[PDB]
Design a binder for this molecule. Structure first.
Ligand SMILES: [Cl-]
Ligand SMILES: [Cl-]
Ligand SMILES: [Cl-]
Ligand SMILES: [Cl-]
Lengths: 137, 137
């Protein structure tokens, strides 16, 4: 097929292992840096940190859709993201997401939110061998 | 194992299908919004846009390491990111990354940069069924 679609973002390599990405539609900007572990500036999310975080953002977003449909205000809910790497080749092996809701939730709802989270688009777009560990506090 | 490591980021659900993520070490902030297609504010990268962009950032970063080792200044290099989604379930199916270098590069170097890009940590952390299409201009 001869058609190429609308661009999502434009990333610019700025030197010193740093990148800057602009999202076309919104015009918002994101920076990445390599860790000091391999000579980067380390004053921004690394690209793999960004991937780990996108999973958590996706989970909270799809939970928000479900919370909106169920008429549950979940503003102030938080997700602590921890990543584990494997070597040879360097890649993400686990992403641990600890979700803390602003209010008290019953078992049925926690389970709905848990299950909805695991089916989200980013969950289905990362390597299946990655252990996606979600805990609700 | 009883030990839990250092947190990467803290994401906060802000309502209206929006999230805010803070990277602990750097203290930098990233926002996500769901598209207007499903009732989000759309004035930020979506979580899957963020994943697609992280691949491109990772590629430019690992190319930067290789360019540094080869003493080639690649500042101003750009990467246009295009994503394709599949349905049932919603997920990323293709990420097209068009890389435009600031200067002229010979065949051997382009090939080194091409190959290094495809081996990067985010490339090895997304779903293997995703077509990662990289073109150098
Ligand atoms: Cl540099
Ligand atoms: Cl590590
Ligand atoms: Cl809301
Ligand atoms: Cl779409």
């Amino acid at each position: 097929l001869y058609f190429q679609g609308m661009t999502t973002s434009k990333v610019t390599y700025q030197g010193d292992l740093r990148t800057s990405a602009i999202h076309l539609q919104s015009n918002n900007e994101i920076i990445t840096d390599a860790p000091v572990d391999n000579q980067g500036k380390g004053e921004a999310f690394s690209p793999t940190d960004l991937l780990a975080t996108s999973l958590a953002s996706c989970m909270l977003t799809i939970i928000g859709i479900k919370a909106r449909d169920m008429e549950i205000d979940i503003a102030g809910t938080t997700a602590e993201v921890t990543k584990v790497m494997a070597a040879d080749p360097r890649r993400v092996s686990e992403v641990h997401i600890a979700i803390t809701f602003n209010q008290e939730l019953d078992d049925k709802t926690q389970k709905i939110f848990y299950n909805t989270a695991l089916t989200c688009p980013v969950a289905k777009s990362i390597h299946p061998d990655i252990f996606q560990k979600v805990i609700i506090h």
